[PDB]
Amino acid sequence: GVVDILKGAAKDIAGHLASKVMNKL
């Protein structure tokens, strides 16, 4: 499930990222 973890892993990073924007609105 490597490929499955590789993609799902990016979700953890974009987590604190996609927050920056959401933090504005």
Swiss-Prot record:
- Tell me the InterPro entries matching this sequence: Antimicrobial15 (IPR012518)
Biological process terms from the Gene Ontology for this record are: defense response to bacterium; symbiont-mediated hemolysis of host erythrocyte
Q: In which tissues is it expressed?
A: Expressed by the skin glands.
GO cellular component term, pick one: extracellular region
Point out residues bearing the modification Isoleucine amide.
Answer: 25
Q: Give the main localization category.
A: secreted
**What's the domain of life for this entry?**
Eukaryota
Which cysteine pairs make disulfide bonds? none
Can you say where in the cell this protein is located? Secreted
Q: Does the keyword Zinc-finger apply?
A: no
Q: Which family does the record claim for this protein?
A: Belongs to the frog skin active peptide (FSAP) family. Ocellatin subfamily.
Name of the protein described by the UniProt record? Ocellatin-K1
Organism annotation:
Leptodactylus knudseni
